[PDB]
Scaffold this active site. Structure first.
Site, mmCIF file in Angstrom:
data_model
loop_
_atom_site.group_PDB
_atom_site.id
_atom_site.type_symbol
_atom_site.label_atom_id
_atom_site.label_comp_id
_atom_site.label_asym_id
_atom_site.label_seq_id
_atom_site.Cartn_x
_atom_site.Cartn_y
_atom_site.Cartn_z
ATOM 1 N N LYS A 253 -6.609 -10.037 -0.185
ATOM 2 C CA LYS A 253 -6.529 -11.151 -1.135
ATOM 3 C C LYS A 253 -5.084 -11.632 -1.216
ATOM 4 O O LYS A 253 -4.166 -10.990 -0.644
ATOM 5 C CB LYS A 253 -7.080 -10.683 -2.478
ATOM 6 C CG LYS A 253 -8.559 -10.296 -2.471
ATOM 7 C CD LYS A 253 -8.968 -9.884 -3.887
ATOM 8 C CE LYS A 253 -10.356 -9.330 -4.050
ATOM 9 N NZ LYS A 253 -10.831 -9.374 -5.444
ATOM 10 N N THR B 41 -13.860 -0.901 -7.789
ATOM 11 C CA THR B 41 -13.457 -2.311 -7.940
ATOM 12 C C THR B 41 -12.330 -2.432 -8.947
ATOM 13 O O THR B 41 -11.373 -3.200 -8.771
ATOM 14 C CB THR B 41 -14.705 -3.220 -8.278
ATOM 15 O OG1 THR B 41 -15.441 -3.326 -7.004
ATOM 16 C CG2 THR B 41 -14.255 -4.606 -8.765
ATOM 17 N N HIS C 83 -10.782 -6.905 -0.511
ATOM 18 C CA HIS C 83 -12.230 -7.158 -0.625
ATOM 19 C C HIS C 83 -12.912 -6.366 0.503
ATOM 20 O O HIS C 83 -12.342 -6.463 1.604
ATOM 21 C CB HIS C 83 -12.625 -8.645 -0.457
ATOM 22 C CG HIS C 83 -14.123 -8.758 -0.295
ATOM 23 N ND1 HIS C 83 -14.986 -8.710 -1.372
ATOM 24 C CD2 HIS C 83 -14.881 -8.856 0.824
ATOM 25 C CE1 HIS C 83 -16.210 -8.809 -0.895
ATOM 26 N NE2 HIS C 83 -16.172 -8.880 0.416
ATOM 27 N N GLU D 200 -21.011 -12.199 5.351
ATOM 28 C CA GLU D 200 -19.561 -12.406 5.231
ATOM 29 C C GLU D 200 -18.868 -12.643 6.542
ATOM 30 O O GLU D 200 -18.082 -13.599 6.621
ATOM 31 C CB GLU D 200 -18.926 -11.283 4.420
ATOM 32 C CG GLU D 200 -19.172 -11.440 2.912
ATOM 33 C CD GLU D 200 -18.882 -10.257 2.052
ATOM 34 O OE1 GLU D 200 -18.516 -9.243 2.699
ATOM 35 O OE2 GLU D 200 -19.000 -10.229 0.840
ATOM 36 N N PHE E 158 -16.693 -17.368 -15.269
ATOM 37 C CA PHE E 158 -15.426 -17.107 -14.561
ATOM 38 C C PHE E 158 -15.392 -17.684 -13.145
ATOM 39 O O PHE E 158 -14.315 -17.819 -12.535
ATOM 40 C CB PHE E 158 -15.180 -15.611 -14.487
ATOM 41 C CG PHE E 158 -16.269 -14.784 -13.887
ATOM 42 C CD1 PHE E 158 -16.333 -14.621 -12.494
ATOM 43 C CD2 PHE E 158 -17.197 -14.140 -14.705
ATOM 44 C CE1 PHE E 158 -17.330 -13.830 -11.937
ATOM 45 C CE2 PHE E 158 -18.201 -13.333 -14.149
ATOM 46 C CZ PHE E 158 -18.269 -13.187 -12.755
ATOM 47 N N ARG F 144 -15.627 1.176 1.850
ATOM 48 C CA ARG F 144 -15.695 1.043 0.393
ATOM 49 C C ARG F 144 -14.993 2.182 -0.335
ATOM 50 O O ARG F 144 -14.314 2.024 -1.369
ATOM 51 C CB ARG F 144 -17.167 0.981 -0.034
ATOM 52 C CG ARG F 144 -17.627 -0.469 0.154
ATOM 53 C CD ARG F 144 -18.167 -0.917 -1.157
ATOM 54 N NE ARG F 144 -17.665 -2.262 -1.487
ATOM 55 C CZ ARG F 144 -17.869 -2.743 -2.733
ATOM 56 N NH1 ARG F 144 -18.465 -1.971 -3.660
ATOM 57 N NH2 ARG F 144 -17.467 -3.978 -3.040
ATOM 58 N N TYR G 135 -18.707 -16.728 -2.555
ATOM 59 C CA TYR G 135 -19.072 -16.382 -3.926
ATOM 60 C C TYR G 135 -20.296 -17.077 -4.507
ATOM 61 O O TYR G 135 -20.458 -17.057 -5.760
ATOM 62 C CB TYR G 135 -17.832 -16.609 -4.862
ATOM 63 C CG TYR G 135 -16.698 -15.645 -4.549
ATOM 64 C CD1 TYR G 135 -16.897 -14.264 -4.654
ATOM 65 C CD2 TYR G 135 -15.442 -16.081 -4.138
ATOM 66 C CE1 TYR G 135 -15.889 -13.353 -4.346
ATOM 67 C CE2 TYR G 135 -14.429 -15.181 -3.841
ATOM 68 C CZ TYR G 135 -14.633 -13.807 -3.941
ATOM 69 O OH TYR G 135 -13.622 -12.935 -3.619
ATOM 70 N N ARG H 161 -6.705 0.801 -3.561
ATOM 71 C CA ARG H 161 -6.489 0.280 -4.918
ATOM 72 C C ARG H 161 -5.804 1.303 -5.812
ATOM 73 O O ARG H 161 -4.889 0.952 -6.591
ATOM 74 C CB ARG H 161 -7.796 -0.261 -5.503
ATOM 75 C CG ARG H 161 -8.204 -1.519 -4.785
ATOM 76 C CD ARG H 161 -9.068 -2.440 -5.557
ATOM 77 N NE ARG H 161 -10.366 -2.571 -5.029
ATOM 78 C CZ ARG H 161 -11.347 -3.185 -4.464
ATOM 79 N NH1 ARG H 161 -11.392 -4.435 -4.056
ATOM 80 N NH2 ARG H 161 -12.496 -2.522 -4.278
ATOM 81 N N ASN I 160 -6.705 -7.141 -7.567
ATOM 82 C CA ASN I 160 -7.068 -5.894 -6.892
ATOM 83 C C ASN I 160 -6.902 -5.895 -5.413
ATOM 84 O O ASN I 160 -7.663 -5.173 -4.736
ATOM 85 C CB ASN I 160 -8.441 -5.472 -7.380
ATOM 86 C CG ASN I 160 -9.618 -6.319 -6.951
ATOM 87 O OD1 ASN I 160 -9.515 -7.410 -6.364
ATOM 88 N ND2 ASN I 160 -10.825 -5.830 -7.241
#
Lengths: 152, 152, 152, 152, 152, 152
Positions: free
Chosen positions: D12, D94, D118, D129, D60, D88, D52, D105, D115
């Site tokens: 990100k 998350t 992704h 994706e 949001f 993951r 998304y 993270r 964060n």
């Protein structure tokens, strides 16, 4: 032939003591050199005197032998193209004060009498040192999977 | 005597081949554990079968022994308080898929058949494993300078 | 603006094969250089022949092109004050054996033929190289938040 | 082949801004995962709205899209046994505060909204994706030399 | 008394801002140097002008003082054999463009006005610098456990 | 408001002794937390007794005070969202044996009496500890350039 050149690297008692065994090996691993022999041991004065025979007639020789006999050491044999010379470059100058940041001695030690590592000098002496510290049975022969990506 | 417990750790052929020897050694040295013995060698089937004797009845026994004999290994002994158990915690679950990020297996490998390191199971198996892989002549006794900052 | 100079840096097939992409990228980010373009690709002989046009007459020419076409590569564009020149410094000498420790080549490779990375020669050739490997749309323009802490 | 599973991992804008690209890439290479696609890009709102789509009704939603469009990103495709799931694990929870040390993270960020990375949810969404972010021609197929030391 | 030489090292505002405080400290600690004093503070112009008194006649004097007062600094004192000179070698040339990869400046910065650290020039300036930045109450005397493996 | 939460972290005498000051700071830097105060010092028994007042009526209290007074320490204040709790997570379990690989204690120490670091317990105690170890004048206030990339 030239890629089969070998050298003797030894972590001195202060290298063991200050926890630099993993870090030193890793530097050689990463570079693409090949680990041929490795052991942890307490060097005998008898072995240290043979190793350091050239300093026999030099002042404070017995102090050096005594120091080398004060803690365990990590003798090793690395193989590859110009490993003797390149190995020496990686170690940095024998005197830590003249060692450059990035070399092993440049990043980890200060004084010449506590310079954590030894690396053969030249091919001929690498030859003599390997034979002094290891049996031919202790020299492992193998082939790294990444070989073709290291050598033309 | 608690602080003198010993465990057997071994870098498998895939650990050697993927250049993790120093990274692994570094992990034990940083922790505060003390290296007692180390060597680089090619293990015979004779030794492997003995080593893996408990899996004799297992169908994957013969392949394990065959795999473990396909490249050099780096057997070693570490000493320190609760080293068998802590040692097992540091390597992570046997199946890399269950290892958590942060452990050795967890961070560097993916499949159970290529899980790069071997660590003793329990004190009793550690003792057998150390006796199998090393002579009493090769286990070094020495005192780390920081011992008192590690152990009360 | 001298801070907007760009250079072309490409990770060769041995670098990819040896897992040095992240580490190489990290050296440039650490430094304060700004990433402008990045992609993973398999370069065609036609593409490699334009990249190496000047060596067309050389006897090794064909060897070079086949080699550069033997695995994927990572072409990238970095931006910043004296990046062409500084980038060159960071990589080391073309011949890894001449590359000093702390440099990308010094620390990670040994032979000239398998020297893991490529860095533009000068400003003029960086411009030529970027146009060959990327499209105008592939160059990203952004402002790092730490810009004022990197440049006066 | 279970070893051919693919997952989508994207750095990100805060990750790019904070200089964590090389380090993130390094975590996947270290592990034995295989890089299949990589690019540096500024994602359009249109692109982010397909990525998304499911959150379209959320309050949001619009905030998210503007944020993801506020800086460049690094979309990538990794391949290997259980990579969707293992990937993951490597990233952490998350919510970074729930992410344990040793995870991407856990070690590098604090707030959910910033964060840094992704990772696909599952195999089905990884496929969705990858198609959204890359073209068929952008997926590189190659064989790492260490493949036999990574998988049985 | 040789081994008790002291030098003043200071992380400039850009070093603080780019998160290099621990990386820098780590570099001195690994070397074998001993931390004598450390603090985190925002320096007044009053102190900076005193500190930079020698550059009073320089046209960049007022801006330097203004820049150095734009963020917190991390002043510190290190002790060890030849620390002023070695210390200067570790940070690299004052102008980052001349620093070699492997040094602090060399690896982490690009322009002379954002060169992240300050290191004393000579023994005489070290003494003045230490007296300016620290009270005698803040210089700690202690003996590292590995002292004998560092200094003969 | 919640991002302004602060905690007290202190490197104990064994952390200083074994060279973990840089490594510990770096872990907090990297995470995105903000350094508010830092100093190197020799804690007085008078200060240690206040700090450890809760163990007053507990066995061997004087041994603890004595131990804490045996070497210099590195008190620090870090600021950020849920830093108390997150800080605790990063440190790992107070008893190193229950600490996970990846936590500070998991990677660097073994026994509870030599567990290199201390981190406030809860907000309220963080509050009391900060005030005991630092003056309000020693708490620096600044704003990191990367802030918006760390917090929403």
């Amino acid at each position: 032939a030239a890629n089969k050149e070998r050298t003797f690297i030894m972590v001195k008692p202060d290298g063991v003591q200050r926890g630099l065994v993993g870090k030193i090996i890793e530097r050689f691993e990463q570079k693409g050199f090949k680990l041929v022999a490795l052991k942890f041991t307490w060097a005998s004065k008898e072995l240290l005197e043979k190793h350091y025979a050239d300093l026999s007639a030099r002042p404070f020789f017995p102090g050096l032998v005594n120091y080398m006999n004060s803690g365990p050491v990590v003798p090793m044999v690395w193989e590859g193209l110009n490993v003797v010379k390149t190995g020496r470059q990686m170690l940095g100058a024998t005197n830590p004060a003249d060692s450059l940041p990035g070399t092993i001695r440049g990043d980890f030690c200060i004084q010449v009498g506590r310079n954590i590592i030894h690396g053969s000098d030249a091919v001929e002496s690498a030859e003599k040192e390997i034979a002094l510290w290891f049996n031919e049975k202790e020299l492992v022969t193998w082939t790294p999977a990444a070989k073709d990506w290291i050598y033309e």
